[PDB]
Amino acid sequence: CRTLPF
Amino acid sequence: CRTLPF
Amino acid sequence: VKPNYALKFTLAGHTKAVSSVKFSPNGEWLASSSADKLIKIWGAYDGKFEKTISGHKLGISDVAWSSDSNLLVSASDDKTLKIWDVSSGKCLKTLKGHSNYVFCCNFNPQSNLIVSGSFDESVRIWDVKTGKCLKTLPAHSDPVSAVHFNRDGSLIVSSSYDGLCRIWDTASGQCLKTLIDDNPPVSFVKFSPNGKYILAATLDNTLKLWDYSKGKCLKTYTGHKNEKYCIFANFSVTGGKWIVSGSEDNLVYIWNLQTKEIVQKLQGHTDVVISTACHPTENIIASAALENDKTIKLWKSDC
Amino acid sequence: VKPNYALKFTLAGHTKAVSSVKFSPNGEWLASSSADKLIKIWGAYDGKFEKTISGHKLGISDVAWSSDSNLLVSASDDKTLKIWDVSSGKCLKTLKGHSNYVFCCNFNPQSNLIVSGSFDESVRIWDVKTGKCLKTLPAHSDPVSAVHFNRDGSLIVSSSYDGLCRIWDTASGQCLKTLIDDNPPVSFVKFSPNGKYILAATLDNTLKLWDYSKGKCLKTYTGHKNEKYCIFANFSVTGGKWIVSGSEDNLVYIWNLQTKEIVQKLQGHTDVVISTACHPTENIIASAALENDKTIKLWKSDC
């Protein structure tokens, strides 16, 4: 899920 | 031109 | 379905016949060119006069917008095209090289090129940034009535009083095909928004939708009067899918694209409707007429 | 020599973060994918919204175009890829097989194959025409952040949070090379246009240019911020030779490929610029940003 960090 | 016939 | 275009504004100001109206790609302005040597800018939605743009020495037959709505190009009887900054009105470049009246013009989508067609029978491709002629195509054997880029800029289509319509490869200048001997002069040509069809006007009161890939006529639209002038036609795609054209009987004609039946005739002008144009997002038509009229009318529909 | 990219359009419409923008190979379209489960299509030169494409059940992390500009493929959290007819908006195929969400995708130049990478840690190669999986490559030991075909589709380069980039032979699915000093997570990789080099981003605020033959690092670009997101980078080749990348400080970064100097930063976005893309023929950049911005910006440079 590209829009989420780490 | 354009606005002249034929 | 049928539309319901109703008159909303009549725009007065040109002192001679008007030759071409075009909406800016951002939907904000309408530009008009005229035999009076002027370009005028109008608000697309209210009709309000915005500015006059001058510099040509003779009448102007065509006008066209760059894709970012910041530039105009005009084709004039003074044998030049001019590129204009719309906000300042200043002439950025004068495009010299045609040996006779310049009749028609268009940016490519990228707007790094301009194509022009002239009574000198040639099509020319010009660099917007420098104003240099990049290529001269010996396109036809009679005045060239229309030039248009397809939606990705890789094709140019041209039309001429010689009876021919030809498609050109932008990059190389080479002719890719001809859609033809007499050929009831071809007075107007442009690509469909999807690049597959070409709409062509012949001076026998006929419009035709051509499948460019197969070279076959798919639709024929009649009813209007077109024997003498190079009239602009359009696809209308914001609401119902129509064909729109001016007409020598002073009416705007709107056909159902698929069934070819007339769905509306717009009444009001008092001379030949030489030019029509369709707003890029709203169901708005601009129409413009010759010497007895000299006005631009805006029409609005709910569909 | 340094570029002068200026803002031309801001494209609003996505209702969650934007995850990927790509220009069509014919240059006429920008496609955008988003956490809002939607693909939007935009005109590359006037910014004009064209259509929304829907069908995925969860958010979309990537999108890519077939070489003829007629097909799109999307990678989604619903664990599928979908093949879209751009003209009609219809889903032509749904590509099932990944066991976790799909992060990245690309057509090969022939556009008969699709490559994909997933959190399930595998790379998959699909048949466009049938929608069937041809090969599953056990490519990595952590989420696959990027996949890319070289200039003729003979090779695939992948990257992963595991710290590696691997180069695969497409026909066999066998691994050719594994570029390895340290192993910070690799967040993006792609081939150069000539296929000789690969550009790889690691989550230590670093971009690197590798010679694929010798497996040697030729350049490092830094000064941007990249520690959390898989941000797209690009070779800009239409004017000056640049590297272009988003950044977690809400800026678009541009470097001289050769000197590695930051030659322009593009202000505007109000959240992480997760995605950038370079037009195939014009000096135009598209950028896009995460949930507190949700917009796409088109930028243009004279060089």
Residue numbers in the entry:
A (entry chain C), B (entry chain D): 2 to 7
C (entry chain B), D (entry chain A): 31 to 210, 212 to 334
Question: Which text from the study accompanies this structure?
Answer:
Among them, WDR5 protein is an important mediator in several protein complexes to exert its functions in histone modification and chromatin remodeling. The WDR domain typically folded into a donut shape with seven bladed β-propellers. Among them, WDR5 has been recognized as an important binding partner in several chromatin modulating complexes such as COMPASS (Complex of Proteins Associated with SET1) complex that utilize the SET1/MLL protein to catalyze the di- and tri-methylation of histone H3 lysine 4 (H3K4). There are two protein–protein binding sites on WDR5: A shallow cleft on the side surface known as the “WDR5-binding motif” (WBM) site, and the other one located at the center of the protein, which referred to as the “WDR5-interacting” (WIN) site and usually bound with an arginine residue from its binding partners.
In the present study, we employed the phage display technology to perform the biopanning experiments with a disulfide-based cyclic peptide phage library. Based on the results of sequencing, the frequency of sequence and the similarity with the WDR5 binding partners, we finally synthesized 5 cyclic peptide sequences: CRTLPFHEC(D206115), CEKMVATHC(D206116), CRTLPWNNC(D206179), CRTLPYGAC(D206180), and CRTLPFGSC(D206181) for further evaluation. To analyze the details of binding interaction, we solved the cocrystal structure of D206115 bound to WDR5. However, as showed in Figure 3, the supposed cyclized peptide was adopted a linear conformation, which indicated that the disulfide bond was broken. By scrutinizing all the reagents used in protein buffer and crystallization, we found that high concentration of Tris(2-carboxyethyl) phosphine (TCEP) was used to prevent the aggregation of WDR5 proteins during the crystallization. Nevertheless, the solved cocrystal structure still provided much information about the binding interactions between D206115 and WDR5. From Figure 3, we can realize that the arginine residue stretches into the deep pocket of WIN site, which formed extensive hydrogen bonding interactions with nearby residues and water molecules. Besides, the positive-charge nature of guanidyl group sandwiched between two aromatic residues Phe133 and Phe263, forming the typical cation-Pi interactions. Except the residue arginine in peptide D206115, other residues generally just situated at the top of the WIN binding site, without any visible direct interactions with WDR5 protein. The essential binding interactions between the important residue arginine and the WIN binding site of WDR5 were illustrated, further reinforcement of the importance of arginine residue.
